[PDB]
Amino acid sequence: ESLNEVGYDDIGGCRKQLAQIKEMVELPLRHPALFKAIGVKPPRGILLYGPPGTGKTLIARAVANETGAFFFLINGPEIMSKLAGESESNLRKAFEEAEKNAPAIIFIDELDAIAPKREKTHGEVERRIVSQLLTLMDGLKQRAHVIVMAATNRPNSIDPALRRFGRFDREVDIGIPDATGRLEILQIHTKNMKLADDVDLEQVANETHGHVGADLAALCSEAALQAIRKKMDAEVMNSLAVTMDDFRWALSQSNPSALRETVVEVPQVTWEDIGGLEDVKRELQELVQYPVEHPDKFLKFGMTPSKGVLFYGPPGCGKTLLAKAIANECQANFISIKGPELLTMWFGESEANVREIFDKARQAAPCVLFFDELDSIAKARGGGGGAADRVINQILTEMDGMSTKKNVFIIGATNRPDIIDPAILRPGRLDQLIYIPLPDEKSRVAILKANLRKSPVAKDVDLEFLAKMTNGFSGADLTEICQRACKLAIRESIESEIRRERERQTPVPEIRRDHFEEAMRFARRSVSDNDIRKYEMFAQTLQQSRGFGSFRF
Template sequence: MPDLARTHEVLRRYLNARVPLIVVRSIEPGRVLDSISALAGELRTMAFFEHSRTEGLVEMTSRQSVAEDFSLPGALEHARSTFKARTNANFVFPDVEDIEDESSTSRHMAEMVRLAETRQGSIVLVAAKPVWSGLRRLGMSVTLDLPTVDEMFDTLNGMIDDHRGVVATSWQHDDVRRAAETLVGITEGEAINILATLLTKGSLVPDDVAELSQFKESIFGELAGLERVRLRDGYVIGGLRNLRSWLARKEYAMKADLSDSHLRPPKGVLLVGVPGCGKSLSAKAIAAQWHLPLYRLDMAGILGMYVGQSESRLREALDTADRVAPCVLWIDEIEKALATGGGDAGTSRRLIGQFLFWLQESTSKVFVVATANDVSSLPPELLRKGRFDEMFFVDLPDAQDREEILRLYFSTYLGAEIAPALCGDLVDSTEGFAASDIDAVIHDVAWAMRESGRQAIPGDDELREFFSNVVPYSVTNAEDLAAIRNWGRTRAVPAGTPSSDGIPLASGDRRRVVVL
């Protein structure tokens, strides 16, 4: 990806080669003009002039006005006279209107380029949009991308150094690096505005880094195909010990500075298994515990009715995810969005290919949490090792997990500890319950207390009755459960405590063959 240093060097070579037209594509004209201004100071044998609506035509090194007419036609007329009178003159025009297509302006500019070529001159166009091909082919082009992490780090570090002694800061190198990674995807000016807003508090502490994501999100407004999920405190995963242990290692990798290595940030995890056992909750808990924003990829909003529309929307959504990184990207029930079928004119296959290409090639810190219930409809391409960092099978909670879940929801909804004897009885009676079943029952108990105005928790017998009235998913959908288990137990790492039937433990070094 071109950065400022490389763009600066390319511009130097184009100018030295006396290329008659240089098109610089960028949404940051200020950074481009700073680079050209620096080159004007270095290339003393050339003259550099810059046009703007507010200052008219000025000489770049002295900033002296050279024409009374501030309009673009006036600046072009002065350029024509200059080219006629001397060689090695350069004119810089940022944000010229009506040059995207063939127009009187673009044709006029093309004539000026031809004149410049006869006099060893150059015209530099700084444009955020494409330039008419008939004009662009008269010269060369270069693109200045948004600041890289290193460039953003230098910008933030310089600004913080300028405020030391005025603003109390405890940010260290790693904090500034995390801030730079958070703000990648926006312009340098936007990053400066965000940090300046943060500095007005009078201090900078490491916890302030998390606030940068909120400022960054406000810049993008409505994100195409992405829905920001508002997080609250208290997201806790009950059970799923194997998954939680694995995620703890990935948190370090997501926050580590990888600039001095060839290591890639984590790609994400695919959670398959029994409905109601914590797959969707895991996405929210990961984002909350890692202090990262959570975005949900809305595939219903991605799918369009016209050929190519769905692919375009998905590309835009994934590009936006890269820009708002670091973040957690949640794709709920991914099999419904990417299921292959013969009645969609190949749209599903193209979406799968586009998503997998992004998953393979993206280097942004976007941690994907994809969940699936109907594992039989998952496309085989999605399951190949290397797509996701790991694939976990989320089964019904075992006795140890059910005890943890019971204690968790008693504390959450009833504000009390469950008695050991009652806990043991409920662990036995909830065999076959999903985590959502246990959640729903204890939630109903809390509502019953509120409706009746009772402060005391119901007695043990009454609590047992609440649970006895529930028919769990394992009973109502026994056939589906058996199919899900038969698929997942041989193809994925168990998310919970492995049973004694030979299901392997998750390991960073373990590799599995997916049987399809």
């Protein structure tokens, strides 16, 4: 009724995506007179594909309301609920009603329900509703000024005839709300929750991971009810204090759904967490930023931008936080495909779900498609074989497919660079290889400073001394130095509280440098001298300058 009015301010979790919606379906609706005189063909379907509970209904209702177009809702399960032959009547009546109110927004939510994948559709009446929808979008694409968007979980779950042109051509990935998106969603949902000012709304927004807007509403709901069941007695009702302990309890008891849906997000590493690596930094800038931030020069000199690069080197030396950093300078959506995902695709024989990954990269462009641990499969069949894995081959196919445009950069990184498919290293594919060595003294002092950031560390601790002592230490070992110093600070502080409460009732404010000594006593240089030796042998396998130096004339 009067509640649904929903506007742009009431929508959070999507800024670029909602702006994309506005540039798609507000100019040809608010002022279509300026539109068709040019001769430009209007969109006639905006297939909003995203995880469930992102409030896609609220998004489309806000876009319709702040345009004035008559938002008419077609509930999917409602259509499938009605008997055979009345669902087709309801669909045609819906489109006919919406062409009356000529600026209209038809929003067929749960398009999976009425029109799933064509192999799933079983009955003929369940194939006369998909067909009726198809002919409706054709006839209302060619006529009557109505624009029909729909909300789906994924773009394989829709009948492929709907993605054909004229029908649902456009797609908008509503996706997971990111950290600032979760901030906006918490502010909207906590407009009236009247916290006790202990809640940041920012720290919780950072430590909610895999939480769509419905999950954030559930989080605020359970936190408010923890406040209610903590008060436990009408004026005392208005004096409820939703304190940060309630939000931490709600987080500890929140079941999120948006995990296993990979998140595209500009990461926060800023090239100072990964210090050093200066020549690698220059190569990554020249490979990512220069194609996208200075693309005129590339088309001037005729150079095609490289499709991909391939890190390699010792494990846990700052390879993942070295593609996040360059995705942060590029301000590109960062898509990390971890090794277990590639392995899962290699074991289920579902080698066609990496088409979906590259497609998601295409929509989320510009990208840094960090195929982390690209040699997981080659380790998993160490040995009858020899090359060309199941899904490595599909990675090659969808890597050769996309053009040097669309600014999608694959930065797949391998611990073992020799067991990988040698067809990956062909030109056009991940031809540039970049050795990521063990941290240099600047690099590991930056690593030690970054791992100890947000942790209360002393002033008399000499972190450059630590970084100067540690030569062969990989980045992961330098984390485990700090995560055994923080852990021992935990032990000492808790033991302090324990012998205080049992005796003094009846503090270790910071990680003192005597914790960084007995924590450093358990220091394991995890990468051997024979691992980095082989990585150097592969590195100068890729160095065959050999006499063409001082090529003068």
